[PDB]
Design a protein around this ligand. Structure first.
Ligand code: ZN
Length: 46
């Protein structure tokens, strides 16, 4: 598994793709878009 997680992101927003976090909703809602393009190992919206 090689899992490495703990607690939660001090911030309310978090990217369930690269394990990121933002302070402003407009900052994350946009960052998630960058992931909605390439063909990474893990398809979504299906
Ligand atoms: Zn991300």
């Amino acid at each position: 598994g090689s899992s490495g997680s703990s607690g939660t992101a001090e911030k309310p927003f978090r990217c369930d793709t690269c394990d990121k976090s933002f302070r402003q909703r407009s900052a994350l809602n946009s960052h998630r878009m960058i992931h909605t393009g390439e063909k990474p190992s893990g398809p979504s919206s299906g």
